[PDB]
Design a protein around this ligand. Structure first.
Ligand SMILES: *[C@@H]1O[C@H](CO)[C@@H](O[C@@H]2O[C@H](CO)[C@@H](O[C@@H]3O[C@H](CO)[C@@H](O)[C@H](O[C@H]4O[C@H](CO)[C@@H](O)[C@H](O)[C@@H]4O)[C@@H]3O)[C@H](O)[C@H]2NC(C)=O)[C@H](O)[C@H]1NC(C)=O
Ligand SMILES: *[C@@H]1O[C@H](CO)[C@@H](O[C@@H]2O[C@H](CO)[C@@H](O[C@@H]3O[C@H](CO)[C@@H](O)[C@H](O)[C@@H]3O)[C@H](O)[C@H]2NC(C)=O)[C@H](O)[C@H]1NC(C)=O
Ligand SMILES: *[C@@H]1O[C@H](CO)[C@@H](O[C@@H]2O[C@H](CO)[C@@H](O[C@@H]3O[C@H](CO)[C@@H](O)[C@H](O)[C@@H]3O)[C@H](O)[C@H]2NC(C)=O)[C@H](O)[C@H]1NC(C)=O
Ligand SMILES: *[C@@H]1O[C@H](CO)[C@@H](O[C@@H]2O[C@H](CO)[C@@H](O)[C@H](O)[C@H]2NC(C)=O)[C@H](O)[C@H]1NC(C)=O
Ligand SMILES: CC(=O)N[C@@H]1[C@@H](O)[C@H](O)[C@@H](CO)O[C@H]1O
Ligand SMILES: CC(=O)N[C@@H]1[C@@H](O)[C@H](O)[C@@H](CO)O[C@H]1O
Ligand SMILES: CC(=O)N[C@@H]1[C@@H](O)[C@H](O)[C@@H](CO)O[C@H]1O
Ligand SMILES: *[C@@H]1O[C@H](CO)[C@@H](O)[C@H](O)[C@H]1NC(C)=O
Ligand SMILES: *[C@@H]1O[C@H](CO)[C@@H](O)[C@H](O)[C@H]1NC(C)=O
Ligand SMILES: OC[C@H]1O[C@H](O)[C@@H](O)[C@@H](O)[C@@H]1O
Lengths: 113, 122, 438, 122, 122, 49, 47
């Protein structure tokens, strides 16, 4: 029932800045943390960071805290990600994923984009 | 707890009086629907206090004073007691239950006052 | 053998369960104003009672949250709606000498006011955080939330304050109160006590830290969930209260516009202009931070501890947020969270702070409130009691804790940890060697 | 009236049984909050009628028929009776209380029918 | 049922005690007005359970322990029993009802435990 | 008038004529069928009862 | 938008048909016969 569509992408020129997005179908926008995970070709997945949709708090992996940026527009139930100065190795596929959170902890991913 | 809730109907007075606990137990469980709880509580409490006023709260069956008359149901029922279900019996006696209740209540008062007067000699 | 069944009523045995709890209000005040009656709760220490507690799991925090929402809704319901004020704003904002701070200045627009055939020009001031820029000429502005929600002005006569609230269970349910002085939010309590009602809890509303609450018995206490290290929020509870003071020294002028509902706006400011700010006992602050660091590196064995201000997010989380009466504050908290560590009123700190009127409702967005201006200069004083921290994962070899706690439920989570509610089970049986007589 | 509302816990079972009136008394005292009164009344009335069905309404302690079994809690409770709180004993017996209740109720029916038959010779 | 609801007043307590059933019966029958039912039920149940705790549920008049001495009502009222019409006696003894109730409750506990101890020899 | 009360704006959409009633004069003039007699509430799509 | 989102019908896609329904002919054709047989029980001797 729940859907996480995505847009943006395609080719991006070297050194440029690029913007993805995910549109959250109606489940409840404020209750579930959203994570941005990616997969280089011929490699295992890895996490970039997570953004709480409610207050917009981001948090990033240590190796990309200079280059990343997350933020949201709660009215549209829409999310955005900005990655600055693409390098060659960042050629990869990028996913949104909903997170199942308890009252005080974050557990795992259930529905992928 | 719900099994054969009114199933004792149809049968003799005696056997059908075996299941009376099955019925006695029943006071169970939009926003406007809350009043059903109050209605059930009202019914149960009114019946219970009436049995208290007749001095018959502590039992499901008990005897009292004020013998039967040719008045009220001018009937012989001990032979019909076996083969008659309660529905007809209630239909027959509803004409006079209201008269009988006052006699029962005053009998309880007489009993308790006599017992108190006997107690007064303690 | 021959142990006949016997029954006992009035038994002391209970079980956990949810239930609807009574609130209780003060004898004096401004549903809530006069009722429920002010209690006189007693308390016993129970000899050998051993009960488990879980301050994350318990239900009544959610009931607190829902009751707070409902009370705010009821209070806000009769107030005026500011829908006709949504018209285009044509404002240039260069009149007073100290223009740049506010940049909404007599800010002009049209209103229908007395007669519905008429339409009249007015103007008033606004802080630019309550405004968004339309395309084209910058003079074209709009109210921030008016394209997304309907804004209600707060009823000035019904000003609401953190009045303490006592919660009382109904008959058949008893509230269990752990008296342990070093309780971590989970695990057994061997010092169980019971009460009619909880003490008077206030509905504090703040972010990154809390301003009015109770204090710990031992030293500063750390409470966090322990399902996984990847936690959402970590609660640090102070034993040593620390004073904080704040001011809004500029004198405000109230002005009124009628729709006949009286809308209130900000008139011309009187006196020379300062930026609202706060003060902190400087030695006390990073003495307390040293204590908190020493406590915090107990859990985390052999890694450094460091603080930085929050990054990203709305103004409600990037800054410490609170309210002096009928005004709201957002204080740029960079200086307070910049220490680093490794394995008594001198030198007073000051921190800059901004105020804005149009507040998205704290618990959730989509409904907007407008606070009318408070005339004259304002100061309020509070004494903080705890911090709401969150850990940045990922970075190997270096922990990092930053002020979060924007989710309003956590404030009451950090205060209702004391209690639990249990259903009584008065009826029980036992074997014994005596039967009925015929 | 509120004092030692559960302080009987911890102590031996009889000493805890000294205070049963203290717990027994408790049926006391936004517009949405009215339902708590109904909930308390419901609990009290359901327990009271259950004691009535077992013929044990009129007392805080009483005995019935249907002796104890080696099944259920196969315990020598009488020695531990001076050690352990109702919490542990209630936890132990909760697996079998529901079994026991029907036996007590049918025992009350047997007692009532036997007594009624004896009265019928009046 | 409604007749002479408080007409027993004025007369002696003894004659007024004849009509106690008439008062005892009455728990009878906008949306905001629902709470009256709950209030009446609350009153009736609280009084009934108090009589239960004193072992006096089953009677309109019963008997208990402990006396009047020079303390409490320092009075002789038996001659005034035929002169009192309750209300002024109630005003007199309201100073000490609250004291008396605890003694009554503990007396019921003593009776129950003594009877249980006698039962323990069964 | 969409969001700015000073800004009336033209739009258009489709309707089935059974939801439409003709006004006098030019047939181009129509009205919503029930608007002269009642107030119309759009169904909440998320409900979908 | 009025911020209430009103929904209307946009441009129709694809070639147009009139909405319709389907019924198995013989099933209805016999069901009416059964209903007629039942119905003339109540009403004695009329078509
Ligand atoms: C009510 O009005 C408010 C503003 O007053 C409005 O909020 C704005 O929404 C837009 C998008 O809906 C946000 O725009 C984003 O801005 C960031 C930088 O600030 C950009 O990185 C984003 O870029 C993406 O989106 C563009 C399309 O908008 C793409 O062209 C681009 O390539 C990227 O994919 C994006 O532009 C804007 O930040 C907010 N404003 C605020 C203050 O938050 C709100 O949406 C309105 N209500 C409704 C229901 O729409
Ligand atoms: C808890 O925080 C609140 C504020 O968030 C503190 O309460 C506020 O205290 C100030 C004085 O310290 C009060 O100011 C006075 O208010 C009256 C009433 O309007 C006014 O007439 C005076 O001129 C003065 O301004 C203020 O009202 C009061 N409440 C609020 C909502 O600001 C409180 O002190 C903190 N707790 C502790 C223990 O200090
Ligand atoms: C809270 O207070 C701190 C100050 O202690 C604020 O940090 C400051 O934020 C400004 C934002 O403009 C930073 O300016 C930066 O300048 C560089 C050029 O040197 C530019 O490239 C950046 O884009 C940015 O504009 C400034 O450096 C920074 N100061 C420090 C010491 O970090 C912080 O923004 C305040 N936060 C809030 C929410 O008010
Ligand atoms: C409380 O804070 C002040 C301000 O930081 C501390 O003094 C400075 O500490 C920094 C490092 O945090 C040093 O680089 C400075 O040299 C210190 N002095 C000054 C004048 O800035 C102060 O030591 C702290 N108090 C305690 C008791 O630790
Ligand atoms: C100036 C202002 O704030 N509001 C309006 C303005 O938008 C409008 O153009 C003008 C008509 O002359 O009437 C006034
Ligand atoms: C007064 C009290 O309850 N103190 C306890 C202590 O007994 C226990 O050892 C400790 C956790 O180990 O928590 C605390
Ligand atoms: C710690 C313990 O075992 N019992 C304590 C007791 O000492 C203390 O007096 C009481 C509060 O007054 O709380 C409980
Ligand atoms: C923290 O202090 C260091 C000291 O050099 C400074 O460079 C840095 O900007 C400070 N950060 C904040 C957020 O105040
Ligand atoms: C079925 O319907 C057709 C309609 O053309 C009718 O001619 C035919 O008589 C019906 N079937 C029977 C068995 O009569
Ligand atoms: O987070 C809200 C707000 O934050 C800042 C900018 O990124 C804006 O585009 C965004 O709308």
């Amino acid at each position: 029932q729940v859907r996480l569509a995505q847009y943006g992408g395609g080719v991006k020129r070297l050194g440029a800045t690029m913007t993805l997005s995910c549109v959250a179908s109606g489940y409840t926008f404020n209750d579930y943390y959203i994570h941005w995970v990616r997969q280089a070709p011929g490699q295992g997945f890895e996490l970039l960071g997570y953004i709480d949709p409610a207050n917009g708090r981001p948090d990033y992996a240590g190796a990309l805290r200079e280059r990343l940026s997350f933020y949201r527009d709660k009215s549209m139930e829409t999310l955005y990600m900005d990655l600055r100065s693409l390098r060659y190795d960042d050629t990869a596929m990028y996913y949104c994923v909903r997170n199942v959170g308890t009252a005080g902890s974050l557990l795992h991913y259930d529905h992928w984009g | 707890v719900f099994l054969g809730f009114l199933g004792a109907a149809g049968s003799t007075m005696g056997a059908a009086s075996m299941t009376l606990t099955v019925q006695a137990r029943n006071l169970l469980s939009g926003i406007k629907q809350l009043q059903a709880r109050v209605l059930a509580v009202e019914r149960y409490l009114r019946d219970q206090q009436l049995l208290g006023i007749w001095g018959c709260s502590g039992k499901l069956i008990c005897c009292t004073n004020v013998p039967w008359n040719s008045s009220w149901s001018n009937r012989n029922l001990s032979e019909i007691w076996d083969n008659m279900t309660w529905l007809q019996w209630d239909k027959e006696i509803s004409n006079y239950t209201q008269i009988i209740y006052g006699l029962l209540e005053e009998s309880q008062n007489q009993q308790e006052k006599n017992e108190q007067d006997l107690l007064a000699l303690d | 053998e021959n142990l006949w069944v016997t029954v006992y009523y009035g038994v002391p045995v209970w079980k956990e369960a949810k239930t609807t709890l009574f609130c209780a209000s003060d004898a004096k005040a401004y549903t809530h104003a006069c009722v429920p009656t002010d209690p006189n709760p007693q308390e016993m220490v129970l000899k050998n009672v051993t009960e488990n507690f879980n301050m994350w799991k318990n239900d009544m925090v959610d009931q607190m949250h829902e009751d707070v929402i409902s009370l705010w809704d009821q209070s806000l319901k009769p107030c005026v709606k500011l829908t006709p004020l949504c018209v285009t704003l044509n404002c240039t904002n260069a009149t007073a000498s100290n223009s740049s701070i506010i940049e909404g200045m007599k800010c002009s627009f049209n209103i229908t006011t007395e007669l519905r055939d008429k339409r009249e020009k007015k103007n008033a001031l606004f802080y630019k955080l309550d405004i968004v820029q339309l395309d084209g000429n910058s003079s074209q502005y709009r109210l921030i939330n008016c394209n997304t929600s309907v804004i209600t002005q707060a009823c000035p006569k019904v000003s609401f304050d953190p009045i303490p609230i006592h919660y009382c269970a109904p008959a058949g349910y008893a509230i269990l109160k752990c008296n342990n002085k070093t309780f971590t939010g989970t695990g057994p309590c061997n010092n169980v006590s019971t009460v009619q009602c909880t003490h008077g809890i206030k509905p504090v509303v703040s972010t990154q830290l809390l301003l009015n609450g109770s204090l710990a018995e031992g030293e500063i206490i750390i409470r966090s969930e322990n399902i996984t290290k990847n936690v959402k929020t970590i609660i640090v509870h102070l034993n040593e209260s620390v004073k904080i003071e704040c001011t809004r020294p500029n004198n405000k002028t109230r002005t009124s516009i009628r729709i006949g509902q009286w809308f209130y706006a900000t008139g011309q400011v009187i006196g020379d202009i300062r930026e609202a700010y706060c003060n902190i006992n400087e030695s006390k602050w990073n003495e307390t931070l040293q204590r908190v660091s020493k406590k915090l590196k107990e859990y985390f064995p052999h890694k450094n501890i460091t603080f930085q201000p929050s990054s990203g997010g709305d103004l409600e989380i990037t800054t410490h947020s609170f309210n002096c009466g009928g005004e709201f504050f957002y204080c740029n908290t960079s200086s307070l969270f910049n220490r680093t560590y490794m394995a008594n009123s001198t030198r007073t700190i000051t921190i800059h702070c901004r105020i804005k009127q149009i507040i998205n409702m704290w618990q959730e967005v989509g409904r907007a409130m407008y606070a009318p201006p408070i005339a004259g200069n304002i100061t309020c004083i509070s004494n903080i009691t705890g911090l709401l921290l969150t850990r940045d994962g990922g970075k190997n070899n270096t922990e990092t804790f930053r002020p979060g706690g924007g989710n309003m439920k956590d404030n009451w989570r950090s205060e209702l940890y004391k209690y639990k509610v249990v259903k009584i089970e008065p009826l029980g049986v036992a074997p014994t060697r005596c039967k009925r007589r015929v």
